[PDB]
């Protein structure tokens, strides 16, 4: 694979890797996310500490309502993720 | 990094390998485009060869009008190749 097809693969195993885990294994629940978050995303995101903010995070994400993230919504969330890394540098 | 991490650089990473070659350094061209989806998509898109292709690719990703791809049409477009991946597997 080329650096790009690499990147398009790893966006869809780690999405499954914590999607996988408990209950639907296509979606995230809350505790999947905050994991994702905390250990995945460690150097560019606060690490979530409050369920508060994990119920909050999950509010913006969820757009189909369902209480959960899907691979949809997951993609948005990469998608503004590396958007501010962009604007970053 | 985190396998995560690393994805989302080699997305900027990318798009700067193939936005600075030409013109406007922060937006690709059609021949910017044309160059990253052979080189960086071989496995996944079929080869351009033929000008109505890269112009129907540029047409369909250029959301704003300008003719040129910038980082967040460039970020759409790789939303529509992954979501379309991870659908050729088991998705729900
Ligand atoms: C991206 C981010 S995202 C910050 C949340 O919007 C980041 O924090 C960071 C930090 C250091 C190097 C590179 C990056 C990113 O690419
Ligand atoms: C991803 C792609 S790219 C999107 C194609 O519409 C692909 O073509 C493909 C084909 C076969 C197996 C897996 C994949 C992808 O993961
Ligand atoms: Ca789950
Ligand atoms: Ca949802
Ligand atoms: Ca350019
Ligand atoms: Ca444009």
Same mark, same amino acid.
């Given at each position: 694979?080329?650096?790009?097809?690499?990147?398009?693969?790893?966006?869809?195993?780690?999405?499954?890797?914590?999607?996988?885990?408990?209950?639907?294994?296509?979606?995230?629940?809350?505790?999947?996310?905050?994991?994702? !978050?905390?250990?995945?995303?460690?150097?560019?995101?606060?690490? !979530?500490?409050?369920?508060?903010?994990?119920?909050?995070?999950?509010?913006?994400?969820?757009?189909?309502?369902?209480?959960?993230?899907?691979?949809?919504?997951?993609?948005?969330?990469?998608?503004? !993720?590396?958007?501010?890394?962009?604007?970053?540098?």
């Amino acid at each position: 694979m080329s650096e790009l097809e690499k990147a398009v693969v790893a966006l869809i195993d780690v999405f499954h890797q914590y999607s996988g885990r408990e209950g639907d294994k296509h979606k995230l629940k809350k505790s999947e996310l905050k994991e994702l !978050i905390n250990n995945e995303l460690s150097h560019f995101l606060e690490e !979530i500490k409050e369920q508060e903010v994990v119920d909050k995070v999950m509010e913006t994400l969820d757009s189909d309502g369902d209480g959960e993230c899907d691979f949809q919504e997951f993609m948005a969330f990469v998608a503004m !993720i590396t958007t501010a890394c962009h604007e970053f540098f």
